[PDB]
Design a protein around this ligand. Structure first.
Ligand SMILES: Nc1nc2c(ncn2[C@@H]2O[C@H](COP(=O)(O)OP(=O)(O)NP(=O)(O)O)[C@@H](O)[C@H]2O)c(=O)[nH]1
Ligand SMILES: [Mg+2]
Length: 166
């Protein structure tokens, strides 16, 4: 079994916890809406390889977290999440990417740009705009809904594949 340390980042309210919980849930607990940053585990077979995913659901930059720097040092890949109905969350992506680059001292960190809440009609960030940004970073872009589950597994598995291909 190969272990991957994945970190989910992005602005307050974009759906970092909803995404993490949707991936990792065993559904014994009906509703789980975490209020605090935390770490979760999921075992999954990705392309024949049994993987243990350790997933850190971080708070947005506007919340204080003592361990944030060490989180980024430990993290092997990062899901950079914004919400497709929240332009500010999209503009904020630059800040998360600069923080990771500053801490890890690298331009080549495995990452996936995630445009969450794609179930919503009230879109303010066009897919093409986010594809352009992802292209500028040299990373994949994947739209998700934590409500419908669309794209959720693909986002996390794409990140694993980026780590593996690094
Ligand atoms: N329509 C829709 N709502 C979503 C989606 N993902 C999350 N939400 C909703 O958006 C809100 C924020 O979700 P949450 O998972 O707490 O986001 P967060 O990024 O972890 N927030 P925080 O930074 O404060 O921990 C909740 O009301 C949640 O139900 C999605 O894909 N679609
Ligand atoms: Mg959260």
């Amino acid at each position: 079994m190969t272990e991957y340390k994945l970190v989910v980042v992005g602005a307050g309210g974009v759906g970092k916890s909803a995404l993490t919980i949707q991936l990792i849930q065993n559904h014994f607990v009906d509703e789980y809406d975490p209020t605090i940053e935390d770490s979760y585990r999921k075992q999954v077979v990705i392309d024949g390889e049994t993987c243990l995913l350790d997933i850190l659901d971080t708070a947005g930059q506007e919340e204080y977290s003592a361990m944030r720097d060490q989180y980024m040092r430990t993290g092997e890949g990062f899901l950079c999440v914004f919400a497709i109905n929240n332009t500010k969350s999209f503009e904020d992506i630059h800040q998360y990417r600069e923080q990771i680059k500053r801490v890890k001292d690298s331009d080549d960190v495995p990452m996936v740009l995630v445009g969450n809440k794609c179930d919503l009609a009230a879109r303010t960030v066009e897919s093409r705009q986010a594809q352009d940004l992802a292209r500028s970073y040299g990373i994949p872009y994947i739209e998700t809904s934590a409500k419908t589950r669309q794209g959720v597994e693909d986002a996390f598995y794409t990140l694993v594949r980026e780590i593996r291909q690094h």
